[PDB]
Structures are given as structure tokens and as C-alpha cells.
Amino acid sequence: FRYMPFSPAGTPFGFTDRRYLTMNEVGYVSTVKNSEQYSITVSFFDVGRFREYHFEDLFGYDLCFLNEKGTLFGQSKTGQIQYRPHDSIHSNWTKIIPLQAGERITSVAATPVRVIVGTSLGYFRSFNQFGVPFAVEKTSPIVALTAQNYRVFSVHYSQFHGLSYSLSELGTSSKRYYKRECPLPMSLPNINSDMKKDANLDYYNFNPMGIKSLFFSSYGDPCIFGSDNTLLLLSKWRSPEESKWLPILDSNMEIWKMSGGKETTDIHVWPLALAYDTLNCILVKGKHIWPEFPLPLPSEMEIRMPVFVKSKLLEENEIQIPVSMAAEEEYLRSKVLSELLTDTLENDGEMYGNENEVLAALNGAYDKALLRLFASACSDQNVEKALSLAHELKQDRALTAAVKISERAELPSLVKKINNIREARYEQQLK
């Protein structure tokens, strides 16, 4: 297997002379073949904040990572890296990463406070924002890196284990692991025999693992976006025994819904970032699945639990969703987001300053969607299913609403059982 230089949302040259090195919510970085050299352009989506600039690349940088304070460039073969702060306060700096025979840099990443470099032999090299080196670590061969503040999410690959991931924090002194080389259940690309003349074959030669992008969510949860075009989020990563990968967006299904239940072939999603409940992306219209020049304006795609079936969506009919079927997904989504956010606040506290209200609204949406399911269950005289739904309610005021719904539905045994829940919670509340 050949380790290829990876960068988040990077695109291949393909049959053209330009491509994107990397791409996220901050902006995009492109490189153009300029005879014997290259012309690198760093652009931003917040044109107010930052100023687009460019420079001549005499080195042939094929690795890049963009954050809000600077840009990191990498050269996979010579091992030359350069960090370029956006602002004039700090100076650019360059370094040469030691590389053994056949060892290539496979991925680079940078935050305002950390710079990380990964190699094909699994060497993990980290620095601070000024280039002061940390201890050097040896891990499994690295294929992809991303980072946020002091935390690093790394993907590894062998012929032995397959794909794994690590989740760590780069402290003042040493590196500490939240998760160390756990299984990474991302689906690999299934390349056929009719792909050798396919228009998109170039991408999988450029990115064999098919990792279109990977990143921390705005709230700090690791995400990855593979060739199956499903957004996977890592849940409960602070609890090793409870950690789970959750599929929280089938973008193929969303495009199908956007197209009014019609199968398309010319619309594709390019992932930039995850903001709370919304996928920042590029909608690529064309033959190829990666964006080209000029770059479209970023779009937004709300995450959706993959519980919708095409056949059932057609019968109830842009596609409209039956309020009852919509309630199941909204319940599931709210349940997941609430559980994630609660873990974030109880461990890291607030970051932006409005999370508690977000969580509060979240729990509100949760109970509301749950009550709609409860209503439906009551209408079908399904007391058992209704009681199970009632148990999942959060607010005591929501238990009240369920009783009132049960009363109107004339289900007296259900009412008593729900009031038992109220009493049972009051008893546990005093212990």
C-alpha cells in the first residue's frame, strides 16, 4: 500500500493544472502549476476578517492545513514544513523534518497553539506555535491528522489492523491519550473494474482511503467523512468503554431528498466543518466529485439521523416528511446532540458562552418530539409503547403534558403509571 500525502478536503490536480491543497470553514488554499514552480493562494470565507494572499512555491508543497491564526505547508518528500501566521505579529518559520529512506510526511496539522507532523513510518512530531519541538513519538503509520486547540485526532493504517484512530491532548510537558488506536469503522472505497476509465478514478489514486475530510466539531467532537459520504461522529470519547462512532448524516440521502426524491449523478457534497447541528460544505455540481475553479459559495446541510427510507418517503409524497415519521428522527437527533453537549459542558465547560441555552433548547426539542410520538402511540391504543416513550421524557413538566394527553385519550391506567414515574423520580431526587 502506498501512503499518499493527505490534507482535509484536498483535491487532486486531475486533468487540470490546479487543485486545492486544503479546505475548511476558515477558507481554502489552492496551488497552480507555474511552469517549473507553483503559485499558492490562501483565501478566506470571512473576507472582512482576513485578506487573501499568494506566494511562489519553489518547493512543491503538497501538504497543507489551515486554521484561524495561520497556515501550515508541507512537502511530503523533502520533509520541509513552513508555518505562516496570518497576522504580522509573529514571523513565518521553516523546518526540515528528518526522513529515513522511503519515509514520507503523510499529513500535517496546526492549531493556534500546536503544530503536528505525521509520517509514513508512524513518527509523530509536534511543536508549539513558534516551532519549539516536543518529545518525538513512535506510533502506527499515520494517514491523516486534524487538530483543535491542544487536542489531536489521528488516523493510522497497517496491513495488520486496518484503520485505527487515536485521540490525544498535547499538554505542556507530554502527550496524553483519550483513546489509543481504537478501531475506525469508516467504510473504505470499493473500487470496481469499470473504474479504470471512470472520471473520478483520479481521486482514489490521490486519496486511497477515500477520506474526503476529517475534523473536530465546533463543540470538540471528532468527525470523519469518507467515500460513502456519511458523516461519522465519535461519541463518548472521554469514556474508553463507552466510545461509539455515530452516523449522523447520509448526504446521499439528503441530496436525494433535495432533488424531490429523484436519483441524481451530478450533485456531490464536499465537507468543510461541523457546526453544532449543521454541516458546512461545498455543493459540487459536475462530473467530478471534488470542487474545482471557481469555488462555489459554501452551503449548509443540517444533520439528520439515517432513519428515513426512500420507499416510505415517496408514498407520503422537495420531499415532504410525514410529521409522525419526522418525530422519530427529531427525537433521535435531539437525544444524540443533547447527550454529546452535556458531556462537553460537564468536562470542558462553555467555549462560546451560549451553550447552556443551546442545551436548554435542545432538551426542549427532545421532549417535544417525544410527546408527538407519545400522542401517536396513544391514538393507536398502544398503552405499552406509550409508557416506554414516557419513561424517556426529561422534564417533569413534560410528564405533566403526557398525563393531559393520556386523559384526553381516556387511558386512566396510563395516567396512574405516568404519575408513578413522577413519584419515583421525586424519591430518587432525595437520595
Binding site: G364, D367, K368, L371, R372, A375, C378, S379, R397, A398, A401, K404, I405, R408, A409
Partner: peptide, 10 residues
């Protein structure tokens, strides 16, 4: 049940 549902939202 629409009236009870509306009461909880506010």
C-alpha cells in the same frame, strides 16, 4: 392533541 402540545412549547 395539538392544543396540549402547544402549551408545552411556551
Amino acid at each position: 392533541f395539538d392544543d396540549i402540545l402547544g402549551e408545552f412549547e411556551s
